[PDB]
Structures are given as structure tokens and as C-alpha cells.
Symmetry: C3
Subunit: 450 residues, 3 copies
Amino acid sequence: KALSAVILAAGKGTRMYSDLPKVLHTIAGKPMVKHVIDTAHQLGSENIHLIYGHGGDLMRTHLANEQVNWVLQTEQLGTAHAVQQAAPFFKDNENIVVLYGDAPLITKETLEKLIEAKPENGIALLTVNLDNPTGYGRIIRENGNVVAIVEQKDANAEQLNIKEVNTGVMVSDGASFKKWLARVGNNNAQGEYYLTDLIALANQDNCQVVAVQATDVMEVEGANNRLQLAALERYFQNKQASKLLLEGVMIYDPARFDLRGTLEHGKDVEIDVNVIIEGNVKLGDRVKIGTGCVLKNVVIGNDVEIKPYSVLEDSIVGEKAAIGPFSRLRPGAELAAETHVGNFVEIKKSTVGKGSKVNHLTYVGDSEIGSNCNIGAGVITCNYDGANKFKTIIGDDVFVGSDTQLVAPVKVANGATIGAGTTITRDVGENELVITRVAQRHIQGWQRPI
Amino acid sequence: KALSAVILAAGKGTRMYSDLPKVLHTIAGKPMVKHVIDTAHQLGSENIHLIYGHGGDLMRTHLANEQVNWVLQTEQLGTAHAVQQAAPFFKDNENIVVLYGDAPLITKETLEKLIEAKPENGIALLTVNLDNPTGYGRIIRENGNVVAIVEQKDANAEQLNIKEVNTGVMVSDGASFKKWLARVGNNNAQGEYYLTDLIALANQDNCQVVAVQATDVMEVEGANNRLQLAALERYFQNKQASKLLLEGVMIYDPARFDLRGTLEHGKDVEIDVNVIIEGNVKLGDRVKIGTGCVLKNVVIGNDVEIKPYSVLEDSIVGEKAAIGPFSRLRPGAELAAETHVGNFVEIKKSTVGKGSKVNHLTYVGDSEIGSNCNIGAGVITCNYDGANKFKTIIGDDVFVGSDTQLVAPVKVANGATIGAGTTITRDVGENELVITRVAQRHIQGWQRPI
Amino acid sequence: KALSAVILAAGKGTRMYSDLPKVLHTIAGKPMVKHVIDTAHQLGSENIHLIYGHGGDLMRTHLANEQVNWVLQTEQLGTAHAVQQAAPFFKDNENIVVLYGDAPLITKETLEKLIEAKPENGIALLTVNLDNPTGYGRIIRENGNVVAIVEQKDANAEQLNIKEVNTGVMVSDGASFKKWLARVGNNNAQGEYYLTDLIALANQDNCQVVAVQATDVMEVEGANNRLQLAALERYFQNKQASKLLLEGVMIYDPARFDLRGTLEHGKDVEIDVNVIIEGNVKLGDRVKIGTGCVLKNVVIGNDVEIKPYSVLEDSIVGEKAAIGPFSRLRPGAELAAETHVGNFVEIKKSTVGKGSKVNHLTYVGDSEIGSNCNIGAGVITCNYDGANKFKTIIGDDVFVGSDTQLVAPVKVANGATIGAGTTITRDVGENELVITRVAQRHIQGWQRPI
Ligand SMILES: COc1cc2c(Nc3ccc(NC(=O)c4ccccc4)cc3)nc(Cc3ccccc3)nc2cc1O
Ligand SMILES: COc1cc2c(Nc3ccc(NC(=O)c4ccccc4)cc3)nc(Cc3ccccc3)nc2cc1O
Ligand SMILES: COc1cc2c(Nc3ccc(NC(=O)c4ccccc4)cc3)nc(Cc3ccccc3)nc2cc1O
Ligand SMILES: [Mg+2]
Ligand SMILES: [Mg+2]
């Protein structure tokens, strides 16, 4: 049976004290509403109807490439009225699941179990058990089937002791939503059309409402301020970390590990404390990552060690390379197998060939470096004033002496040797040795002012 | 009604295993006793009488500028005897609050609620409820009014089940303190004059003692060793972090955030994990701070991004600047709007003008740099031997080529261009181009020893 | 009475998803089984019989220098059969303690209390109380003496409410082990010879079995996957940190501190958040360590401050030195008293004399530097192509100007001054001043392309 989803995303989020609307704030680097859209897509939703309102232009800007139907709410008349704006697009046959863009951790696993429990022409309601259910609408069963949701203020002494509560998440067929939504009224203290009233309208219509319990309460929690958002963040990180650990990734402290994206991993991977993994990252077998490292959108080959406080982005690193500590790889850095990148070294948009070393106090930008080169301490690739970032091409088996400037555009051919302190502006031929002739003045018996 | 405070601060803190006296150990970068002095000043105390003893010269050295009356205790005869040394300075009218320099987290809010509850000519006692009250003196009420404090060893079976206990914190008028303190005896196992006996002396005198409960038990806890100090530290940091989060600061993980001072903030500020904020820090709107950064005594303008592992002190950073990763700003660094400071760059005591960039492997010290300058990789400002840190003045629209040394004192005027590898010792005029003439020796067919 | 131990270490650890066998995975940088071997050695064990099996060559490789008897298990027939392979080496007199290589946190203190409780010709059994004992074998007493261990599936309604359970850890004399192990059968669902059956065989033989309770449940827990290993890691780190705090080390956040080795410390030591201490480390009095530092196998003298994000290995640092931030000390770095090492500085295998400073953007390798030298920003020690890391010797009171290359092998004698931008290839004599003669071309009125 086909499926579609409706996601409520119109709220201002006043208590975030932000210019962003509520659902654009991120969990693990991704907006809360994108978590729900992605979950709804994993379930196999055919359409996703996004009820939006506050921060409308920002929603459109930030979610421009999402495959959703953009349903604009111009006034807050409650959850039933919100869903009814999407109702004309519901297929009579096809289940509709209702979700909330500010409760982002709802799992596919829980939702497909909710969808399974839905009786034909009925409703499946997601519920949760709280130790202190004060403030939340209680589930009343008769027997095993939900007959009513009794709000805090209406509940008698014994109903107040019901620990099972309403989450707001609900599944029913499209024909049934169209029917019941048109019957919902707003005769209550707030004057709003409540989606909760579909439970009453279903029973009044002799239709079955079945309750399904959530696995974790955190998966129905919403974030109304940054403190609550931070609690959803730590729960989500802990759960990502636990999954990786059971898969065999040795994360030394899972409370000091952050994944903000996707991680593919080999076996015997070791990750020390305070590491941040962003975007799409792939790690081969026996990769070791030291403390403080940040990896964003990188592929790391088998048997690579990354030493402490290295920052890597949009880069490729071949097997058996050694990086760090204090290394920086900027976008376009491609390191071949068995390369060495050391402390206080920045590599931007450059390819470095097999076995080559760049171990100290060096900037290599917009370059090609061949295999088994030795790039000395203090070497800098640079440009003329008014230039447009031109290229430095270094061949195989080249020795570049310490504190040499390579002035692009320039080529240094295979087997060349460049002495320390050189300024290289002209192409260097194959097996050419280039030494700087210094002039010095020596003064004997110069007493220092000490 | 006027107020003054008495703070007990004489203890050795043997179990800290330190040369510092007990109350000088810090919480959030500030001595425990300074927390209490500051709280007492926030309440509006007119005098603060500081009972000190052990580590007397160190207390005087470290707290030299505090507006306190220095009351020296030469011998431990108990809390009543300690307070009585300050008593001659109590005004008959004026409330006196008693506090402890080794219980630093007592809040102004709790204390002004304690002061309000004090009945005329009576005592207001701060109490707290413990789940396991074993060891602590129990509050006995009759009815709603405190009649006695029964110590662990004296309490019958049912009194042992009283969960409400004495904190030691107390408010009464000065006339009443002088009267009752002179009546306190020391006929007990320890032979000391106990402040607790004022509860008995008050009732024996037909005066009312009213109990007021503390909000959090942590706010009456004392630190007798570093393990307890560390627990007070984490409670205090968590509470600072929660406050900032409810104010709209996005702190990605509040368990990995430290504030040791004061933070002023705009809206939409984002702070990643493992950041330390020290002294007085001001952050404009939409400032983003990456992982591992340390900010001490800095002003950061609107829309600044600070990238990972940057350390900044006594500096100003203008709007839309970009700093990091791996940047170091030392005291006197002033960066104008739209500036760029990159990896492995140290700026000390220098002004850098609007739009200028200093992006790699560079030391700029004691300099002025104008607007829209390009300071190349490897550039170093330096001095002659025996010099006294003289100044390097760079004008507007200057290009300084990579790996150039600027030897102070020297001026480089507007629009000058300096080629790579240059040593600049003489002033450079407006629109002057300065290129280094290299001499090189080329040897063809030189076979490397490989 | 003499002692020996038997350690069960043969398991594959399938659920680690590793090429390492189970007990080689580390806690605090040391294999789980080495924790137990070391504990067994601290107890005074005369022999340690190591039952090994899966990953046999790796065990032999990684534990090659351990003083253990290598007892190879070729087939899993249960714990009684495993111990019986070591039994021929038990002395009739001498206690044998049985331990598990995958439960590493068992303390010497608990084990010597277990050994004390052993009645002559009897058994001492280590037990623990669980709140939920489901799955674990219950201890049945009659009275005060263990009569049976009833497994989950065999226990009646009231036995299921026994919270005291079997740990597997056991002490009995060698003669008694030989006797009872030969009597153990395998008529059970799994078909294995169970060590638990010695409790029954002991009583059936009219011998006394006495129960001793473990202090902490974590000290009998085993790690069957990396998630459980990570929980043992955090418990162990917390406990190491608490011990240091009670000894007077100020650890600002004990949840962000890691010790992977041994730490010797003076008094008034301060350690900020996210510090990692590895191998054998010694810290004098009043050492301050800033955030993010990594110290491996180092001696740090009195009154040293290490500033944030410094990485130090196999190094010595004399009293009153200042290191960091962003400093790197590689193996063989020896810094004398009152030295200064600053940001983006790497020191490898070099001695630096009293009062000398190396404060920016510098590599010093394979060198000797004397006392009161000033090593300028950008200075690099380097080698000729084809050389074998030769030495740079700098005497006392030498000034080396910024961005100078020192080309080894070379000597610079006492009191020499070297100007900025110099390439030093020949020895420099006592009180010799060496200045580089630059040739520059100046072009007036050069308009930059802007
Ligand atoms: C952000 O966009 C919206 C979110 C809404 C929203 N978000 C939401 C819904 C449910 C929960 N979760 C719980 O209610 C819950 C949490 C913990 C335990 C048990 C339940 C959290 C956030 N709730 C309601 C209206 C609404 C209010 C209450 C229940 C359902 C729907 N209306 C909303 C309207 C919006 O435009
Ligand atoms: C450091 O200077 C002093 C501190 C003292 C000191 N500190 C203190 C007082 C109270 C508490 N808090 C609690 O007693 C408490 C903690 C948790 C729950 C409930 C209560 C902690 C530290 N207490 C007492 C004497 C003293 C002893 C006990 C109670 C009051 C006063 N005498 C002190 C004398 C000093 O010179
Ligand atoms: C890794 O090498 C081995 C470990 C074993 C091993 N490890 C072990 C033993 C005891 C515990 N601790 C507990 O049983 C426990 C934990 C928490 C609370 C209470 C108890 C953990 C790991 N246990 C057993 C067999 C075995 C199984 C169960 C009990 C004892 C022995 N056979 C083992 C055989 C091996 O070759
Ligand atoms: Mg240089
Ligand atoms: Mg140079």
C-alpha cells in the first residue's frame, strides 16, 4: 500500500532567539526538518507535504533541492487545520503519516512498525510511556484499542496515573483524513482545530484506533530552545557512537566523538578522543586517528595514521601515508601511498606522489609533486603580484632545499636538486643542480651588546 | 534595612595538599572566596568582614584590592568565636549574613530570600533537604519555626529520619549577634564555641527562628579536597552553559564548554566543542567559533568566523574577519573589518587594516599594516641584535612577497611591491618595486646520490 | 603460603570484529591481559600460567617479554578443562588464583582479601551483588558458607531473588585443584567441563567454600565488544583521575583527562581540560599544563608552564621553562632551565642550554645549542642531499637572525652574531659577525595591477 507524509514545519521558535525559523537549526550538521524529510524518504514516501510558514523565504533558500510539496500556512489555526491544507493532495488510497519538523529523531524502524499496526479504515497512534506524564494527553484503552485522549486538565484521579501518553504522530488512509478533518471543530480554550479529535471522530464512526509504543522517548521529543536541542544532539551522537562501536570501530571515548554526516569504515579503525567527522568520510582498514583531528569529506586509505590536531577537508590520502601532527589539508589535496606530511604544513589543491615527504613549516599550493621527492623545511610555493594562482610542477626524485621559494608558473624536472635558500623563477631541467651563490660580510671580534 | 556580611575564610585546607590556603583555590578561574565576596557585594553589603588565618600573607597578596575588613583569627575556637571577632564592627541595626569562603556557589537569589524571611529580632536559617542526611544536624520545627538543631549523635530514631538539615548560613541583626555570641559556651566533645547554639539562645530568649530552604544542595556544598572542588566546577560550568543556551547561544556540547569570566553575546552565536572563554569576552551577532579555540579578553565583531585551534588574547577583531585554523593572536593584536589571518600565523601587538590578508607561516610583531595589503607566506618582522622591539610600518595596498624579512625600524609606503625572498632594511617609497637579484650556479647532469 | 595464578586468555572475541584476539585490545594503552598479568605479579604470584589459543602467534609476538608459562588450548571444552591444562604445574602446596584475561580491572586489594578468606583445603569464591541478577549463577549459602551455584534456568521463584552472583574468580590450593578437576564431568546442555562444579565437588568432599564480595561490579566485568571495552575505559580513567585529585593534583575536568601509563607528580600541579599523559611521565612542583597537551615519556621540572596544544615525547624539560602554545618536542629534545619554546616550533634530538629562546616558526634538529642564545623566527637546521643527519653545534650567547638556514655539519662558536636571511655553511668563529650582502633592484613609480 502506497505511502505519503505530512511534516509540520511552520513554527517561529521564538525561544531559540534566532533569525532562523525553528526547524532549520541543526542536529549533527543537518537541519532538524531534513532529518524528518530523509526519514520520510527512507520509509518510501511518494509525496512529502511540507507545511511551512514562519521564515518562509529562508526555508525555501535552505531546502531548495528537497523533493517536497510546499504548502504555505498563513495563520495558526491548529494541527488539524495545518494537515487539511495538504489533504486535497492525499490519495484516497495510500497511507498518510503525520510528523513534526521540530521532533527530528523519529526512526524509520518505529514508523514502519506504526504503519504495520494500522487497521484498515482506522488510525495507528504512536504513544510513549513517561514516569511523570504531567502535561501530556493520556491514552485511554478499551480494551487494547484507543477510545480517547484525555488532556491533563480533564483527567480524573485514576486517569492522571495513566503513564501512556499521546505523541502526536499518527497514520491513517487519505480518504479517512479528508473525511474526519472536515468534521473537526474548535470549541476549546485555545480555539484551534486539534488533530487529537480524530481519535474521537474515528470511534464515533465505529473505526478502530490502535496504539503503538515508541522505543525511546527521545525519538518523540521536540526542541523548543537550544538547551533542548543540545540534549537531542548528545543523545543522537551517543547512539551513532554506540553503533560504530558494536560494528568494531574503537572509539576511545564515545562521549568525546562527533559524527556530522556519514562514515564508512574498514576493520581495526582506532579513533582517539575529540575527533570530529563531517560530511562523507571513508576510512580503510587499520586507520588510526589521533586526538583533536577534524576530517570533512575525505577518503583515507588502509593503514594510514593521522597524528594529533590535523584538519583535513575535501582530500584523498593513499595507503600507508602518515599525516600530522598539526597538518592541514585543504580542498584538492591528493596524497599518494606512503607519503609523509608533518607539522605546520599546509597543502592546498595539490597532488603529491608516492613516497614523497613534506615534513615542516611548508606551504604547497596549486602544485603537482612527483614520487620520492624531498620537500625541505620552510619551502613555499608562491605567485607574482597580479597573478591568478598558477601552477608549480615538480617531477620525480627531486630534492628541494630548505627555505626555498618556488615562484609559479614553474617546472622542475626529474632528478633535479635545489639547494637551500634558493628563489626559483625559471624552469629547472632534468638532473640539474641549482645552488644559490651568497655574498656575506664577516667582521671579526664583534662584541655583542650584552 | 542595611546589610553587612561575615565570611569565614581561616581554614588550612590540609586535604588539598597545597601551599595555598583553602579558599584561594579557583572555580572558573576565580578564587572560591572571591565568589562569596562578589555575591556579598551583589546583595548590597556595606561591610564585608573577612575572617582569615592560615596562609595570611598569601590571602593579603591575592586579595589585596578587595573591599573587605581584615579580621585575623589566631586560634581555632569555633564558628561562634570567629564571628565574634567581627562583632564589634556590627551596627546594632543592620542585618548580618554569615557565609563560608569554602562554599562558593551560594547565590544572591537564595540569600535575598533568606534575608526577607528574617523576623524582627530573630534569626533566618538556611536549610537543605538531603536524601541521606547522615552526619548533618537536623532541623526540628514547632510549628514551622526552628526550635533546635539536633546533631547526628544526639538524635532519636524518628529525628534521624528528618531529611532537612542545617547549612551553617544564617541572618540576624547586629544587636542580636553581639548579645547571643557573648552567651555561647563550649561544653561539648570538641571544646569549641558553636554558632549553632544561637538557635537555642534565640528560643531561650523567646525570639523567632525561621527556616528557608536552598534551591540546590550544590550551592551550600564546600570543597575540602580537589575532587570536591572539581565537582563544584562541573556543576557551575553546566549552569553557566544552560543559561547561555536559554539565551540563544548555540553551544554544541555544554559538557565541553568552559567560561572562566564574563561573556557578552549577540544572537545566532555558534560555539563548537572544547572552547574556553576567559576574562571578559564580547561576541557580536553570528560569530562562529570552531573546535578547540581559546578566547581570553577579546572583542569579536559581527559575522566573524574563528576556525579550529585558534588562541586569542587581549585582542580586537572587526566585523566579517576570518581567523584560523591554527592562528595565534597575542596581546595588542587589532584586526580591522574583513581581514584574514590563516594557519601558523602569529600576530603580536599590531594593527592590521581593512581587507588585508596574512594567511600562512608568518610572524607580525610591533607593526602597523594598512588596508588591502597582501602579506605573503613566510614573512617575518624582526629586529637588530641589541634593539628594543622597534616598529614596522606598512601602508595601504602593499604587496609583500613570500619569505621576506622586514627589519625594524622600517617603513613601507602605500602601493609598494616587495618581491619574494627579500631582506628589507631601508624605507620603501610610494609605488616602489623592490626585487632581490639572485646569483645562482647551475650544474647540468648532476646525478643525485640515489 | 606461596601463590601462583592461572589466566584464561584463549577466546577469539568474534564480536570485536578484529584481527586481534580478544585480550590484546587495550585499556589505558595496555592490553587487557597485561592488566591481569601485572595484577597477578603485584599479588606475588610465583608462576603465571597463561591459557592461550586463538590469535596464538599474535599473543606470542605482543606478550613476548612477559614472565608467563605458555599453555596452549587447542579446543574449547570449558573452563575446568582449560585450568586442568595448567594443573600439572601446580604445587600441591601453594594457592592458585583463577582469573580472566578479558576482565582486566580486578584489583590486587580485592584479590588479597579473597586469598585471606580461603579456608585450609577449601575454596574462596569471589561474588558480587547485582540489582538485576538475571542470567548469572546465584550463590546459595548455608549458613555463611557456599553450598551451590544455581544457574538462571534451574532456580526456583525465591532463588531468582538472590542478588548475590558468581564471578568465576576462585582461589584454592594446588593439591585440591588437581583432585577436583579430574572429577569434573560435562553432562549439561553445552557439553563442557565447568569450573563451577568445584563448588559441588568441594561440599561433596566435606570441604568449606567461603564467599568474598567484590568492591565494585566493574572490577569483574568483561568486555565482549568495543562498546563494553569503552565503558571499562571510562570507569578506569575516572578512578585514576579521582586518585590523582585526592593526592592534590588539580585536574580541572576529570571526565576530560586520560592517563595511559604512570604519572609521578609534585604538589600544586594544574592540568587543564583534554590532556593526555602517556608512558612514564614525571612532573615537578607547580607545573601547569594547558588545554590539549599530549605528554608521552617526559620529565618536566619544577615551575614549568606548558601552554595549549603542545605535543611532547621522549623529552626532558628543566625548571622554569616555558613551552607553547603549538610547540612540538620530538624524541631526544633536552631543554635546560629557563628556556623558551614558542608557537610553530619543532625541536628534534637536540639540547638547548639555559635561558635560550626559540620562539617562532623554527625547526631545530640534531643540534646542540648553548646558554642564552636567541634563535630567531624562521630559522631552520638542515642537511645536504645524500647526508646522514649531521650535527649543528651552536655555542653560548649566540644571536641567530630570522630566517637563517644552518647547514649541517657546522659549528657556530661563542658570542657570534648571524644576521637575518643568511645561509650558513662554514664554521663561524668566536665573536664573529656574519651579515648577508643583498643585491636589490628598485623600480620607482611601479603601479600595482589593482
Ligand atoms: C515546528 O512546526 C510545528 C511543530 C508542531 C509541534 N511539534 C511537536 C509535536 C510533538 C512533540 N512531541 C510531544 O508532544 C511529546 C514529547 C515528549 C513526550 C511525549 C510527547 C514535539 C513537538 N506540535 C504541535 C502540536 C502538538 C502538541 C502536542 C502534541 C502533539 C502535537 N504543533 C506544531 C506545529 C508546527 O507548525
Ligand atoms: C574555610 O574557612 C572556614 C570554613 C568553615 C566551614 N565551611 C563550610 C561550612 C558549611 C558547609 N556546608 C555544609 O555544612 C553542608 C554541606 C552540604 C549539605 C549540608 C550542609 C561547607 C563548608 N564550616 C565551618 C563549620 C561548620 C560545619 C558544619 C556546618 C556549618 C559550619 N567552619 C569553617 C571555618 C572556616 O575558617
Ligand atoms: C578470554 O579468554 C577467556 C575468557 C573467559 C571468560 N571471561 C569472563 C569471565 C567472567 C566474567 N565476569 C562475569 O561473569 C561477571 C560479570 C559481571 C557480573 C558478574 C559476573 C567476564 C568474562 N569466561 C569464561 C566462562 C565464564 C562465564 C561466566 C562466569 C565465569 C566464567 N570462559 C572464558 C574463557 C576464555 O578463554
Ligand atoms: Mg622562511
Ligand atoms: Mg628565506
